[PDB]
């Protein structure tokens, strides 16, 4: 078959990044709107003193950093250039494992490069790369230099931002990871608006429901989550939260799973008052907390 | 195009294996029947003291070892679990080089992972990995952790058990090897029945027909095989067989090729009397032997 | 889908190469005509004392070296054998990035091997591998042992000669390079005719038009090329050419780009008189030169 039409569609909207820092390094980025906004990875541009964007048509320009988001490994850039080709968006929840995809980037600085593979899996958290993980996995060859570039579906629509690989060799072994478009678009929109992403911030821990601690517990291996360990000087601290008490309920929503609950708390607004309930065998043990702002906190695992 | 339907079909019947031994290691396995029998590689489970099977639906269970077959690198496991999804079988002789295939496994423990490539070649013996080799070769990315998992055709039917790779880097370089379904089903059936595979056993050697030894020989570079070297205390020993005499005929079938003849002898039954003929320029030199049982004897070449 | 028909078409015309030198090494080659001419890489056969060709059908024969071309990394071999299968030719300019292709070779000596990927990019010069570069890039897995073998389109027609890879691991990371058929056929035809390729030869340098040297220059960042540095005892030497003067015109054609101009000079005939113009702010500064012959001057970058 051929993916030429998909490449023709998407490749004009993928650029090369050349960054100098204290010294030179390489990457990719995706043009998201004709106004000149670009998505790339945080680790590509972090601390850079100059960022050059090189387009497929040959034009080069210096970019400005709009803002960056280390906890998803994303960053937004802005350029001032006319008649820019923008990427079409795919549906990252609309993808299935086994669908064909294309990676577009600048591996090893050889030039813009298209590789092909399939969606190997979706929803990869537990990789231990970023705080907020939801990776698409792909076997399209992805190498140092691909970071910040496009993962595209078989029609050329954007489904992710290529980010990381797992390798024992320094280069592709067919296990690569892209940030899904749905996550990346959120981050991008908020950075454009507020210079960063405003998360609901707690300063608290939580880990899995081990079986024997909840064995004695009346419920049976589901529908709850075990808590421990607490950060200090912040609102859970001031709200009476503390290592060892277990969390039934935060903002009235049961925090049954750790990753779910990170997200919910993340999608809250700082300064707001919300109630929190620590463990007792009954319904509640009632605390309150003022939602704070969370401070500030091609890769290979 | 998309392979999503093929993945939907086959992925439920591929499990993760977690084994502890004297210490923890990882692998994959394929559910072959709703009764709970699973195929995997011998090297994954060999000497394990505990074997956990983790299904795509989230269920986990301990497995029992039915039996194992080091000389093909296969092993059979059994689990006790209801409403199990079983793999459909493909036709491993029905495949052609250039057909698309999918590998399903747990590379590096990242999670169940689907990779895509083509049949690169079939019939790979001479790899020097197992005594009985007939590998399918594939460029679908295959890594440590894939061993024991499924190679599937473009419709999701099982064509092989992923086993080994050739790499200079510790991970996929696009040269991987799967045990064909036709071989694996034989092994599986006999292990389920007899706890191992019963081979016809000789205790004898044989190597290629070098050209100048058979130059003088009247026949012309075909249709025969040169012999040498003999194991002892066993039936060829007791049958009057010995290093240096060349084999015309075993069980009346001319042993013209070494790998062919291994197989024939393998598919004989121990305790049976069969006749053997050593080299002389005429028709025969007649010995007899009682067929013995052959004793006990993700990988990277 | 399946590429079996494409493999059936092309694989008979791809051979294994086994070369002994002062000691044994491996490679591939492509049968280009039924007369027994074969293309492979220069680095595979360079300095070999014996070259064996092994065909897919099992026939083996010794090959003769027709001639070789180090500056494109190509070499031509000849064998004497009947009923030979010849490769069909594709159109290497007719390919688009994103088209599917197949690599056919003998990676690591495992046997003839087919791998699949896409055209990742075309026109790769600046790799620094050969003097005359125009590589097709592909993510079809290509390993040591693939050099001299076929890159084929989805219908099995020849589009290139697999040559090199970029890797940090000694094997495929999905960045491989093939010499396009259009270049390779030229080289092959001239070697068959004249034992080598006759290039137009100058003995002179040239590098890019830096911006500030041509800033002051009236023209604006296009349509010219800056010169420097000169080889000696040869015709530019005898023609009055020299480091520092900048070249407007060679054989009346403006030498605006370095790689273009190499080619033009290459496609000229030795012994011919052609005029050359060095830099002055006006039209010309007029020299003459007698075109000389250029003397004599799976890889991993």
Numbering used by the authors:
A (entry chain A), B (entry chain A), C (entry chain A): 53 to 74, 103 to 377, 386 to 389
What does the report in the manuscript say about this coordinate set?
AlgW, a membrane-bound periplasmic serine protease belonging to the HtrA protein family, is a key regulator of the regulated intramembrane proteolysis (RIP) pathway and is responsible for transmitting the envelope stress signals in Pseudomonas aeruginosa. The AlgW PDZ domain senses and binds the C-terminal of mis-localized outer membrane proteins (OMPs) or periplasmic protein MucE, leading to catalytic activation of the protease domain. HtrA protease is characterized by its trypsin-like catalytic domain and regulatory PDZ domain; the catalytic triad was surrounded by several loops (L1, L2, L3, LD, LA) but, usually, in an inactive mode, and could be activated by sensing a specific molecular stimulus. The catalytic triad (H123, D153, and S227) sites are located between two β-barrels and are surrounded by activation loops L1 to L3, LD, and LA (named according to DegS nomenclature).
In order to elucidate the structural basis of the AlgW reaction mechanism, we prepared the periplasmic soluble domain of AlgW and its inactive mutant AlgWS227A. Protein samples were mixed with two types of peptide activator (tripeptide WVF, decapeptide SVRDELRWVF) prior to crystallization trials, yielding four complex structures, AlgW-tripeptide, AlgWS227A-tripeptide, AlgW-decapeptide, and AlgWS227A-decapeptide, with resolutions from 1.8 to 2.6 Å. AlgW-tripeptide and AlgWS227A-tripeptide crystals belong to the P6322 space group. They have only one complex in an asymmetric unit, and their overall structures are similar (the root mean square deviation [RMSD] value was 1.07 Å). The AlgW trimer could be generated by symmetry operation, and similar to most HtrA protease, this funnel-like trimeric organization is mainly mediated by the N-terminal protease domains. Because of the high flexibility, our AlgW-tripeptide and AlgWS227A-tripeptide structures, as well as many HtrA protease structures, lack the LA loops. Consistently, AlgW-peptide bound structures also demonstrated different interdomain orientations, in which the joint angles of the PDZ relative to the protease domain are AlgW-WVF (25.62°) < AlgWS227A-WVF (25.74°) < AlgW-decapeptide (25.47 to 26.48°; average, 26.13°) < AlgWS227A-decapeptide (26.65°). Thus, by recognizing additional C-terminal residues of the targeting protein, the PDZ domain of AlgW adopts a more open form and maintains a more stable state, generating stronger substrate cleavage activity. This is in accordance with our enzymatic assay in which the tripeptide-bound AlgW is partially activated, while the decapeptide-bound structures reflect the further activation of AlgW.
